[PDB]
Design an enzyme around this catalytic site. Structure first.
Site, short mmCIF file in Angstrom:
data_model
loop_
_atom_site.label_atom_id
_atom_site.label_comp_id
_atom_site.label_asym_id
_atom_site.label_seq_id
_atom_site.Cartn_x
_atom_site.Cartn_y
_atom_site.Cartn_z
N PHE A 176 54.09 22.45 38.63
CA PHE A 176 53.80 23.37 40.29
C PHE A 176 53.42 22.36 41.02
O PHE A 176 53.04 22.52 42.47
CB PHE A 176 53.51 24.82 40.69
CG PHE A 176 54.95 25.23 41.90
CD1 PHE A 176 55.92 25.52 41.15
CD2 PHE A 176 54.44 25.29 43.34
CE1 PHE A 176 56.92 26.61 42.04
CE2 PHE A 176 55.58 25.64 43.97
CZ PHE A 176 56.45 26.21 43.47
N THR A 177 53.71 20.89 40.67
CA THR A 177 52.87 20.30 41.46
C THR A 177 53.78 18.53 41.39
O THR A 177 53.15 17.79 41.93
CB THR A 177 51.46 19.77 41.14
OG1 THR A 177 51.57 19.41 39.36
CG2 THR A 177 50.14 20.64 41.17
N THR A 178 54.56 18.19 41.10
CA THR A 178 55.79 17.41 40.17
C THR A 178 56.19 17.16 41.60
O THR A 178 56.46 17.59 42.51
CB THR A 178 56.84 18.10 40.08
OG1 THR A 178 56.41 18.13 37.99
CG2 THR A 178 58.14 17.21 38.85
N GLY A 195 62.73 18.70 31.92
CA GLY A 195 62.56 20.44 31.45
C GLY A 195 62.65 21.55 32.37
O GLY A 195 63.26 22.23 32.12
N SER A 196 62.67 21.14 33.95
CA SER A 196 62.54 22.30 34.90
C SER A 196 64.34 21.91 35.11
O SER A 196 64.49 22.74 35.80
CB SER A 196 61.95 21.75 35.71
OG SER A 196 60.48 22.26 34.91
N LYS A 207 54.66 10.67 36.13
CA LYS A 207 54.30 10.97 37.34
C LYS A 207 53.30 10.46 37.99
O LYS A 207 52.89 11.08 39.16
CB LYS A 207 53.87 12.60 36.12
CG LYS A 207 55.72 12.84 36.58
CD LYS A 207 55.36 14.15 35.24
CE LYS A 207 55.40 15.87 36.06
NZ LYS A 207 55.12 16.89 34.89
N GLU A 244 58.08 15.31 43.24
CA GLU A 244 60.07 15.06 43.51
C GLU A 244 60.17 16.45 43.68
O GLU A 244 60.98 17.09 44.62
CB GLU A 244 60.73 14.91 42.41
CG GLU A 244 61.00 13.22 42.25
CD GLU A 244 59.93 12.83 41.19
OE1 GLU A 244 59.16 13.68 40.21
OE2 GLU A 244 60.49 12.11 40.22
N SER A 280 59.07 24.39 38.56
CA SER A 280 58.03 23.93 38.01
C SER A 280 57.01 25.05 37.46
O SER A 280 56.05 25.39 37.35
CB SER A 280 57.73 23.07 39.59
OG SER A 280 56.83 22.17 38.86
#
Ligand SMILES: O=C(O)[C@@H](O)[C@H](O)[C@H](O)COP(=O)(O)O
Ligand SMILES: O=C(O)[C@@H](O)[C@H](O)[C@H](O)COP(=O)(O)O
Ligand SMILES: CN(C)Cc1ncccc1O
Ligand SMILES: CN(C)Cc1ncccc1O
Ligand SMILES: [Cl-]
Ligand SMILES: [Cl-]
Lengths: 550, 550
Positions: free
Chosen positions: A217-219, A163-164, A515, A221, A214
Site C-alpha cells: 500500500f505504498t507503491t 503482482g497486484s 521502486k 504508481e 497493493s
C-alpha cells in the site's frame, strides 16, 4: 542453512555433462520413438484434478530418454528438491533474504489442513478472508451492494501493478466465458497517464467500484493512480462520505489503507508470505471473484490445491511439475538454450504467457545461491509467447527454421467454451496443435524437398531440421479448476528449477530497487534547469527531455 | 546471386572475434564514460523527421566504443549491406527464393519518386489505392456510407491473421489518441471460435463493417472466420444484396475476393512484393485510416518515407538503423546473447513489442544464406517485451540480476497525449525511463550494499553487476509520423542484420509450411476412430482428444 553451495558441484552435474556430450547433443527424437514402442506411454502422464477432470502432459517429443530423465531425477535428489519443498509446505522461512515464509500454497487450502506459519495455523485466517471475499463479491453481483445513488455496480476497476495486476488481468481474460453480461472488469496499472485517461473515459462514477490492489500500500504508481481515481470519483460524487461505497483495498498494510481514506471494513487482507507473483489466490484475486462469482473462484483455488497435493506426494520420477522443471534445467544448462516458449492454442489464454513470464523470470533471475556465493552457471530462462494459431503465422518461422533451440509448451483444450458451427473452428484449432508439434519433431529433409519439386539452390531454404522439442498439454476444458492446476504446475516447475540452481526463487531485489530509483530523478524534473548529476548519457537524456517536454 | 557465401568468410568477422576477447567480453561502460568526456555525443544521433520533429537515439550505454563500432561498420561494408539496400530500393528481386521484389518502401512513396518493379514505375498504382482508401475511409467517418438500414457505421472489424492482423492491431492501439468517439475498431484473427464469438457478441449487424484482410485470400483461418462473419451478418440482414454495404476486402487476389461475394469495387489491392510483416503501409492499413482518418495514416506513411530516406542516403557510420543492426549482430554473434528486449514507456505502444517480434523473428529466423548454404553461426534473435513501468515490477528482476545478457531498447515520448494532473504522471513515467537505464549501467557494488545496511550472507543477494546495456530512444511525441519512423527504423535494423548474416529476410518457408500442415489431421478429426498414421505422440494426443472432445 543450505546443504550444498553450487549446482555445478553436485556429483550428478558432471555426469549429465558427459551424457549431454554422448547422447544429448545429437539426440534424435525420431530415433527414440523407433527404439521404444512404449515411448508415448513412458513420457506422458495423466493428471487427475479434484473434480475428476483430467489433463494429459505429454513430454515425449522432448530431447530426453530413460537414461537422461533418471540422471536428472538423481540431480534433483542431490539438490534436496524434496527437502526444500517440504520446508515450503511446513511454513518455514525459505525466503531467506527477506526472512519470510513462502505460503501461497496455504491460500488455496480449502481442505483446511493444518498449515502453520510461526507455529500458528493459517487455515482459519485465510478462510476468513475468503468468507469476506464471498460476501462482498456476492453483494456486488446481486445488487445488494449499491453505489452512492443506489445503482448496481456495472464496472470494477483494479488499480495495481506487477503482482497486484497481471494475475487479475490474465485470469479474468482466461475465465471470461464464466462472466455475466453487464458486469465488466478493467485494469489501471501503468503510471503513464494514458492508462488512467483511457480506462475512465467511458465509465460512470455512480456504478464504478475501485479495488486498490497493493501488498505494501505504498507503491508509487499504485497510490498515484488511486489518488487520480479518487479525484475522478469526487469530481462527480462531491462528498467524500461516498468513497466507502466505491473504494476497497487488497493489502497487507491496514494503517496505510486507512490513512488513504478507505474504511478498514473494506480491506481484504493477506500476509507478507504471499509473493506478488504468487498472489492471485489471495485477496488480490477479488476482481476474479466479482467477475465470475466466488464459487468459480473457489473452484480455481481447489484446482491449485489438487496440483499442490500432486507435487507434495508424488515420487520425483512421476511428479509432473518436477519433470517439467528438470527438462528446463537440461535445456538451459546443458544445451545452452536461453528461452522457453509457451503457446496456448486458446484465445482466452492470450495473457497466459505474460503472466508466466513474470512468475518464471522474476522468481529465477538470480545470480546468488542459498550458500550466499555467486553462481558459475546459468539460472532463469527468458520465457515468452503468444496464442496460436496467430503465433504460427509469425515468430513460428524462427521456431521452425532458425538457429536457436527454443523448448516450447503447447496447450489445448479438447472442448471449447464457444463451440460455434458445431465445433468447426475447434477441430481446425486442434488440428494445428497436433500438426505443429509433429512438424517440429519430424522436419523435412533434403530428399523430401527435392521430391516435392524444388531444385538447385532453392532446396536448402525449404528444409526443416526436425528434432525441435515440444511439450504438449491437453486439457479436457479450460475450466476454473483446470486453470488453477495449470498455474500451480508452472509455480512448482519454477520451484523445481530454483531448487536445483540453489537460488531463492522468492525474493526480487531488482524489483525492490526499481521502486526506489526514480524519485531522485523525479525531483530533478520539477524544473527545466540542465542537470549534470549523473553519467553523461543520463544527463544528456534528461536535458534533451527538458528541452522537449511541455 | 550473392557476393559472399557465409558471414564467417568475411575477414572482419574473425577480427571482431579477437576484439571480443580483448575488449568486448569484459567491457566496462562505467570506464568508457570515465575515459571519454564526449561519449554521449559520439554514440547518440538525432533523427529529424519530414515534419521537423525529432527523435534522439542514444546508444552510449551499449558495450561499444570507437574501435568496436569502426570494425562493425567495416563488416557491414564487407557484407555489402549498401549494395543489397540499393537493390531493394531499385525494385530488384532480392527475395530470391520466391523470386519477388521487396518493395514495402514503395508503399510510402508519397513524394512519387520513380520506384519501378520489372522496369515499370509503381508510384501511381500505389497512389491510386491510397486514393481509394482516402475516399472510402472519409465516407465511413462522415456517415455518407450507410449500412443496409440507413445507419452510419459504428464498428469496423478487421478479419485476418499474422501480417494481415498485427500491424492494424498495434497501430490502432498506438494511435488511439487520434480516434473519434463512436467509431470503434475490432480484430478477429485466431481460428479459435472464441475470437469470433467474443468479438461479435455486442455488435450490431446494421452498423458493423468487415474488412477481410488477406494477401492470398485463401488462408484457411481467415476465410473460415470471414464466412462465420458473413453468416452472423446474414442471420440478421437475410439478403446477400446487403453484403455490399458491410464487407470489403484487402488483397492481391481479385478472383478469390469476387468468388467470396465481395464486389470488386470494395476491394483494396496490393502487390506480391509486399510481405505480410511489412504490409501495414498498404491497403492492409485501411482499418487505421478509418479509425484515425486518412490524413493521419498518410502522415504515418510519410514518417516511414523520411526514415527510408535516412537509411538510403546516410553513410553507414551515422546511419541510425544500421548502427542498431550492427549492435544486434555484436551481441548475438560475439556475446552469444539470444534475445533482444524492447520496452515502450508508453501504454498506447503496449502491442509494439509483439509487432516487432513478428517483424524481426519471421524475417531473420533462417538457417540458409543467399549462396544456398547452411549457416553454422547464429541468425535471428528472440525479440520480446512489455510496456514500462509494468515490466519494471516483473521480468526486469532477471534483466538486472540474472545470468543472461539481454540487450534492451527503451522508448519514451517527452510529451504525452494525456498529460493529466499538469503532467504529474508523465514526469513520473519519464523519471523511471532515465533511472532504469542508469541503474543497468552503474549497478551496485558490495561496498554500497554494506553501506546501505546489509551484513553477512545477505550482501551478495543485493548486489547489481551493472554494465548491462541499453539503447534509449527519446521522441518528442508519438504522433503518426513518429510511429512511422520508429517502425521503419526496426524494418531497416532487421534488414541490416539479415544482410550481414547473408540470409533472405523476406521469405517465410516455416509460415508457409504451417499453412499446409493441419489439413491431413483435420480430415482425421471428422470421426472418432482411433488413428495410427503418425508417430506415437501425435497418435496418442489425437486419440486422447477424440475421447475428450464433444
Ligand atoms: O512482484 C512484485 O513484488 C511486484 O510486481 C509487486 O507486485 C509490485 O511492485 C506491486 O507491489 P505492491 O503490491 O506492494 O503494490
Ligand atoms: O507473415 C506472413 O506471411 C503471414 O503471417 C501472413 O500474413 C498470414 O499467413 C496471412 O496470410 P494472408 O494475408 O495471405 O491471408
Ligand atoms: C464452510 N465453508 C465452505 C463456508 C465458506 N464459504 C466461502 C468462504 C469461506 C467459507 O468458510
Ligand atoms: C495529389 N495527392 C496528394 C492527392 C492524394 N491524396 C490521397 C491519396 C492519394 C492522392 O493522390
Ligand atoms: Cl470449499
Ligand atoms: Cl501526400
Amino acid at each position: 542453512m543450505a546443504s550444498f553451495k553450487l549446482a555445478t558441484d553436485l556429483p550428478e552435474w558432471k555426469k549429465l555433462e558427459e551424457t549431454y556430450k554422448s547422447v544429448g547433443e545429437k539426440f534424435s527424437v525420431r530415433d527414440a520413438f523407433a527404439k521404444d514402442p512404449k515411448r508415448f506411454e513412458e513420457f506422458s502422464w495423466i493428471y487427475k484434478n479434484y473434480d475428476d477432470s483430467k489433463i494429459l502432459f505429454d513430454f515425449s517429443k522432448n530431447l530426453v530418454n530413460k537414461e537422461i530423465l533418471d540422471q536428472l531425477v538423481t540431480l534433483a535428489k542431490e539438490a534436496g528438491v524434496e527437502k526444500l519443498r517440504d520446508a515450503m509446505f511446513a511454513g518455514d522461512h525459505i525466503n531467506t533474504t527477506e526472512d519470510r515464509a513462502v505460503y501461497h500454497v496455504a491460500l488455496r487450502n480449502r481442505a483446511l489442513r493444518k498449515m502453520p506459519v510461526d507455529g500458528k495455523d493459517t487455515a482459519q485466517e485465510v478462510d476468513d478472508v475468503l468468507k469476506h471475499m464471498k460476501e462482498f463479491s456476492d453483494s456486488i453481483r446481486d445488487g445488494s451492494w449499491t453505489g452512492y445513488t443506489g445503482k448496481s455496480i456495472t464496472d470494477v476497476v483494479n488499480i495495481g501493478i506487477g503482482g497486484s495486476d497481471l494475475g487479475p488481468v490474465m485470469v479474468t481474460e482466461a475465465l471470461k466465458a464464466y462472466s455475466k453480461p453487464g458486469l465488466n472488469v478493467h485494469f489501471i496499472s501503468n503510471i503513464d497517464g494514458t492508462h488512467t485517461a483511457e480506462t475512465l473515459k467511458n465509465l460512470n462514477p455512480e456504478t464504478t467500484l475501485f479495488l486498490i490492489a497493493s501488498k505494501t500500500f505504498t507503491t508509487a504508481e499504485t497510490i498515484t493512480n488511486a489518488t487520480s481515481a479518487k479525484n475522478w470519483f469526487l469530481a462527480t460524487a462531491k462528498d467524500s462520505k461516498h468513497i466507502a461505497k466505491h473504494f476497497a483495498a487488497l493489502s497487507t498494510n491496514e494503517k496505510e489503507v486507512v490513512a488513504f481514506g478507505i474504511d478498514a471494513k473494506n480491506m481484504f487482507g493477506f500476509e507478507s508470505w504471499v509473493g506478488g507473483r504468487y498472489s492471485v489466490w489471495s485477496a488480490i484475486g477479488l476482481s476474479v471473484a466479482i467477475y465470475i462469482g466466488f464459487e468459480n473462484f473457489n473452484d480455481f483455488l481447489k484446482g491449485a490445491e489438487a496440483m499442490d497435493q500432486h507435487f507434495l506426494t508424488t515420487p520425483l520420477e512421476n511428479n509432473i511439475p518436477v519433470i517439467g522443471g528438470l527438462l528446463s534445467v537440461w535445456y538451459n544448462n546443458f544445451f545452452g538454450a536461453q528461452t522457453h516458449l509457451v503457446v496456448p492454442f486458446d484465445q482466452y489464454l492470450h495473457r497466459f504467457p505474460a503472466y508466466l513470464q513474470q512468475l518464471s523470470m522474476e522468481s529465477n533471475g538470480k545470480s546468488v545461491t542459498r550458500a550466499n556465493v555467486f553462481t558459475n552457471y546459468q539460472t532463469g530462462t527468458i520465457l515468452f509467447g503468444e496464442p496460436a494459431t496467430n503465433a504460427q503465422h509469425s515468430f513460428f518461422q524462427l521456431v521452425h527454421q532458425g538457429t536457436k533451440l527454443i523448448p516450447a509448451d503447447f496447450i489445448l483444450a479438447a472442448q471449447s467454451h464457444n463451440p460455434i458451427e458445431k465445433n468447426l473452428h475447434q477441430r481446425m484449432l486442434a488440428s494445428n496443435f497436433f500438426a505443429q508439434s509433429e512438424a517440429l519433431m519430424v522436419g523435412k529433409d533434403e530428399a523430401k524437398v527435392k521430391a516435392e519439386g524444388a531444385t538447385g539452390g532453392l532446396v536448402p531454404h525449404k528444409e526443416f531440421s526436425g528434432n525441435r522439442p515440444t511439450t504438449s498439454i491437453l486439457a479436457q476444458k479450460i475450466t476454473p479448476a483446470t486453470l488453477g492446476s495449470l498455474i500451480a504446475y508452472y509455480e512448482h516447475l519454477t520451484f523445481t528449477e530454483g531448487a536445483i540452481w540453489n537460488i531463492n526463487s522468492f525474493d526480487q531485489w531488482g524489483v525492490e530497487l526499481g521502486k526506489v530509483l526514480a524519485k531522485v530523478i523525479g525531483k530533478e524534473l520539477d524544473d527545466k534547469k540542465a542537470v549534470a548529476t549523473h553519467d553523461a548519457s543520463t544527463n544528456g537524456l534528461i536535458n534533451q527531455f527538458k528541452e522537449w517536454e511541455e
